Design an enzyme around this catalytic site. Structure first.
Site, PDB file in Angstrom:
ATOM      1  CD  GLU A   1      67.107  19.197   8.783  1.00 43.64           C
ATOM      2  OE1 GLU A   1      67.542  19.764   9.812  1.00 43.64           O
ATOM      3  OE2 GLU A   1      66.057  18.511   8.764  1.00 43.64           O
TER       4      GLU A   1
ATOM      5  CG  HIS B   1      60.585  19.103   7.609  1.00 42.69           C
ATOM      6  ND1 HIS B   1      61.874  18.963   7.146  1.00 42.69           N
ATOM      7  CD2 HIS B   1      60.371  18.061   8.446  1.00 42.69           C
ATOM      8  CE1 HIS B   1      62.419  17.885   7.682  1.00 42.69           C
ATOM      9  NE2 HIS B   1      61.526  17.316   8.472  1.00 42.69           N
TER      10      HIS B   1
ATOM     11  CG  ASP C   1      66.050  22.420  13.972  1.00 42.58           C
ATOM     12  OD1 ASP C   1      66.556  22.525  12.830  1.00 42.58           O
ATOM     13  OD2 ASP C   1      65.129  21.619  14.244  1.00 42.58           O
TER      14      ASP C   1
ATOM     15  CB  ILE D   1      55.236  12.471   4.700  1.00 39.87           C
ATOM     16  CG1 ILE D   1      55.558  11.715   5.992  1.00 39.87           C
ATOM     17  CG2 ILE D   1      53.843  12.145   4.149  1.00 39.87           C
ATOM     18  CD1 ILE D   1      54.682  12.113   7.174  1.00 39.87           C
ATOM     19  N   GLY D   2      56.659  14.471   2.711  1.00 40.85           N
ATOM     20  CA  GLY D   2      56.558  15.506   1.692  1.00 40.85           C
ATOM     21  C   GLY D   2      57.253  15.183   0.383  1.00 40.85           C
ATOM     22  CD  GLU D   3      62.628  14.530   0.928  1.00 40.85           C
ATOM     23  OE1 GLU D   3      63.135  13.470   0.487  1.00 40.85           O
ATOM     24  OE2 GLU D   3      63.182  15.226   1.808  1.00 40.85           O
TER      25      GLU D   3
ATOM     26  N   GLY E   1      57.547  14.870   8.161  1.00 43.49           N
ATOM     27  CA  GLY E   1      58.254  13.648   8.500  1.00 43.49           C
ATOM     28  C   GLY E   1      57.691  13.104   9.795  1.00 43.49           C
ATOM     29  CG  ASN E   2      58.644  10.588  13.941  1.00 46.12           C
ATOM     30  OD1 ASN E   2      59.024  10.957  15.061  1.00 46.12           O
ATOM     31  ND2 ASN E   2      57.773   9.587  13.769  1.00 46.12           N
TER      32      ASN E   2
HETATM   33  N1  LIG Z   1      58.281   6.596   0.508  1.00 48.87           N
HETATM   34  C1  LIG Z   1      57.552   7.081   1.519  1.00 48.87           C
HETATM   35  N2  LIG Z   1      56.222   7.234   1.335  1.00 48.87           N
HETATM   36  C2  LIG Z   1      55.485   7.713   2.341  1.00 48.87           C
HETATM   37  N3  LIG Z   1      55.876   8.079   3.563  1.00 48.87           N
HETATM   38  C3  LIG Z   1      57.194   7.906   3.723  1.00 48.87           C
HETATM   39  C4  LIG Z   1      58.086   7.428   2.771  1.00 48.87           C
HETATM   40  N4  LIG Z   1      59.369   7.392   3.292  1.00 48.87           N
HETATM   41  C5  LIG Z   1      59.235   7.840   4.512  1.00 48.87           C
HETATM   42  N5  LIG Z   1      57.944   8.159   4.841  1.00 48.87           N
HETATM   43  C6  LIG Z   1      57.462   8.703   6.112  1.00 48.87           C
HETATM   44  O1  LIG Z   1      58.320   9.754   6.505  1.00 48.87           O
HETATM   45  C7  LIG Z   1      59.021   9.418   7.719  1.00 48.87           C
HETATM   46  C8  LIG Z   1      60.475   9.758   7.531  1.00 48.87           C
HETATM   47  O2  LIG Z   1      60.672  11.160   7.709  1.00 48.87           O
HETATM   48  P1  LIG Z   1      62.115  11.768   7.933  1.00 48.87           P
HETATM   49  O3  LIG Z   1      62.157  13.058   7.203  1.00 48.87           O
HETATM   50  O4  LIG Z   1      63.235  10.787   7.557  1.00 48.87           O
HETATM   51  O5  LIG Z   1      62.163  11.998   9.513  1.00 48.87           O
HETATM   52  P2  LIG Z   1      63.391  12.586  10.283  1.00 48.87           P
HETATM   53  O6  LIG Z   1      63.968  13.766   9.562  1.00 48.87           O
HETATM   54  O7  LIG Z   1      64.493  11.493  10.436  1.00 48.87           O
HETATM   55  N6  LIG Z   1      62.856  13.057  11.803  1.00 48.87           N
HETATM   56  P3  LIG Z   1      62.346  14.674  11.855  1.00 48.87           P
HETATM   57  O8  LIG Z   1      63.489  15.604  11.581  1.00 48.87           O
HETATM   58  O9  LIG Z   1      61.783  14.986  13.298  1.00 48.87           O
HETATM   59  O10 LIG Z   1      61.199  14.882  10.783  1.00 48.87           O
HETATM   60  C9  LIG Z   1      58.745   7.941   7.974  1.00 48.87           C
HETATM   61  O11 LIG Z   1      58.640   7.648   9.363  1.00 48.87           O
HETATM   62  C10 LIG Z   1      57.409   7.713   7.272  1.00 48.87           C
HETATM   63  O12 LIG Z   1      56.319   8.104   8.094  1.00 48.87           O
END
Ligand SMILES: Nc1ncnc2c1ncn2[C@@H]1O[C@H](COP(=O)(O)OP(=O)(O)NP(=O)(O)O)[C@@H](O)[C@H]1O
Ligand SMILES: Nc1ncnc2c1ncn2[C@@H]1O[C@H](COP(=O)(O)OP(=O)(O)NP(=O)(O)O)[C@@H](O)[C@H]1O
Ligand code: NA
Ligand code: NA
Ligand code: NA
Ligand code: NA
Ligand code: NA
Ligand code: NA
Ligand code: NA
Ligand code: NA
Ligand code: NA
Ligand code: NA
Ligand code: NA
Ligand code: NA
Ligand code: NA
Ligand code: NA
Lengths: 327, 395
Positions: A313, A139, A79, A263-265, A141-142
């Protein structure tokens, strides 16, 4: 022709029809230090586990996953590797020099696989070499990170020594005034670990909002009138906007902004709040496209492309065991 | 023509200026240092002359007494009644003070309450106000707060993404410092430009031993780099500025640093001094670098990148930029640093005029540039005196 992507109390897996990308071997490694400027054919095991000294609870889990998995070439994918093109001015913290030269403390960056994937995914959509663009990719997300790609190389990114710093995230504070920490110890007798937990587990959206770690949850509490949740989304946007601002400064301009992650997508709100009033860059969103999360969501007048690219990824990992292990 | 005195009481310091107002003419300035400690020195300068005496100065009560008797004994003042008002610099006004305050009984207790947050400065700053009120009972005094200017920041700018309790119960948020300086050069820029500040989007860079940058939009601070204390923000002389907060638990868990050693690592051992290993003075680091010292050169380049990064954040926050102000010992004098800081900003219509930048002229931008770049000497004593005369002599 058929490669598999491993991500080690868990063991995510995914096998792909390469090179078509069809579908729930190459190995996700969390921290490559400075030794690995790239994905490595696997002795590599022993300097992976050595760098566990800086990625304790992730590195040996991944390197023992490499060992459990014969006659199949394995490629380790770090990473951090994408970000090893950063200049000293981008990765040296203004600490006493010995903290870097004797303890390895420097910015490293993470999410380098996803940033690398989506940035060249973006170049393929526009039909130009990635090196012809100035790209900020978020990017979100969480975990969340911004990354500045210029001439096809990562030139800055928002996560630092560990994946805790940078922008505000679900439970991680991101960057804060460091002098808060020696103050908390001397006023609430917080131990090193409690401080670490504070920064990693109860801050960010969760700590500010009081509702949740999840953007969607926080966004419902804020529309039903919750003031801490509303503020949380605001600060979320602002943290990322300020970071984007630094990277545009650094690159001398901006050709394309990329949103990815959960969140971004998906979050039209996040993206519109993040892109508000940026006419001085030639960046503006189109409501209709932003709302259905089209691949490009910028306004037709806009000079900056804004893209919504779903990060993949495992498919990026696939393309690297194919390059370094079966060429 | 009023005679206003600006005072700044450190832990062992007593800086002071006497100004003729409202012109701004400086009558006398001075410093008492090593108070209490051996080596205590008293320096007093006017336009013409300078006086300096090493002598035992016990507490601040004795520093103030030597100051007042010197003003008459050096023929500077005809009498101490001639003094029309004293303004005092105060480090931290928290959220209570959005402006400079006339010194009440309530103002001084509210200032010692905030000692919770500026422990080495606020208590002694209030000491100065008390001593002067005792030794100059008839004279009005004004407290001028280094944070006041930044009280116009919105929540999304002063809230740190920590648990809410950490703000709502312990007051942990971005306060910002150098308010008086940014205020002063903000408003000087708008005079020298003939525009009102409401019409400009300004980024102001106070670069000295401490450094901070400040985004002023529509006449108000809307963000500033120092946050909870003056340690944070950009890289500075010996302050690290903003780093990865997770480095700190690592160093406590690994090297065993107490809370106090972390504060000293961050405040006295980092920055220009930490990176170059040479010195904390920009000029001495610069001499080291041109002599071949790679760390010194690295330290000067990191310094420029950290400031560029913050400017970038604030330019984005405001939706553009109309003027960039350079002030403080480094901003005012180092054409090199200003150049390194302003390189490759064609994306904002920002470009420097080399001849003007080499002279440290007042406007150094290039001829076709859309952004004004100003080099303005900050003058916080003048800013203070103007607040003393706004609030203590409204006529
Ligand atoms: N449709 C949606 N609308 C808004 N927020 C969303 C939506 N779907 C997911 N999320 C948010 O995005 C998060 C999911 O992000 P995600 O990319 O799956 O994380 P991850 O890759 O598994 N972990 P990381 O690699 O550390 O970012 C969820 O916990 C929500 O906060
Ligand atoms: N000609 C010069 N060229 C470059 N740097 C200079 C020059 N003169 C002074 N400096 C730098 O200016 C720095 C501090 O200036 P100054 O602003 O007076 O400090 P200060 O007011 O005492 N502390 P602060 O106001 O909080 O920054 C010194 O540390 C020097 O590095
Ligand atoms: Na690029
Ligand atoms: Na981040
Ligand atoms: Na943050
Ligand atoms: Na640039
Ligand atoms: Na004072
Ligand atoms: Na405020
Ligand atoms: Na403030
Ligand atoms: Na500040
Ligand atoms: Na102020
Ligand atoms: Na203001
Ligand atoms: Na700062
Ligand atoms: Na910094
Ligand atoms: Na804006
Ligand atoms: Na440019």
């Amino acid at each position: 022709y058929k490669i598999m992507a491993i991500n080690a109390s868990s063991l995510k897996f995914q096998l792909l029809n390469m090179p078509q990308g069809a579908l729930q071997v190459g190995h996700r490694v969390a921290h490559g230090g400075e030794r690995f400027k790239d994905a490595a054919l696997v002795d590599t095991l022993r300097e992976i586990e050595r760098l566990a000294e800086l990625a304790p609870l992730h590195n040996p889990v991944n390197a023992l996953g490499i060992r459990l998995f014969p006659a199949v070439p394995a490629v380790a994918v770090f990473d951090t590797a994408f970000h090893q093109t950063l200049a000293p001015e981008a990765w040296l913290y203004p600490l006493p020099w010995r903290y870097y030269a004797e303890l390895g403390i420097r910015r490293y960056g993470f999410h380098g696989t996803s940033h690398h994937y989506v940035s060249s995914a973006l170049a393929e959509k526009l039909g130009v070499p990635l090196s012809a663009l100035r790209v900020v990719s978020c990017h979100l997300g969480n975990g969340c990170s911004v990354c500045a790609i210029k001439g096809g190389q990562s030139v800055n990114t928002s996560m630092g020594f560990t994946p805790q710093s940078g922008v505000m995230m679900g439970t991680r504070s991101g960057d804060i005034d460091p002098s808060i920490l020696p103050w908390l110890v001397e006023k609430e007798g917080k131990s090193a670990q409690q401080l670490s937990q504070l920064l990693n587990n109860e801050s960010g959206l969760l700590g500010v909002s009081g509702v949740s770690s999840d953007y969607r949850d926080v966004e419902q509490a804020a529309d039903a009138g919750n003031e801490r949740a509303a503020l949380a989304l605001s600060l979320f946007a602002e943290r990322i906007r300020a970071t984007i601002g630094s990277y545009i400064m650094q690159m001398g301009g901006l050709d394309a902004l990329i949103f990815t992650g959960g969140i971004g997508e998906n979050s039209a709100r996040a993206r519109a709040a993040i892109c508000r009033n940026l006419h001085f860059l030639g960046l503006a969103l189109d409501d209709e496209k932003n709302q259905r999360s089209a691949t490009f969501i910028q306004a037709d007048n806009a000079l900056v492309k804004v893209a919504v690219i779903n990060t993949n990824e495992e498919l990026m990992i696939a393309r690297d065991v194919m390059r370094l292990a079966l060429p």
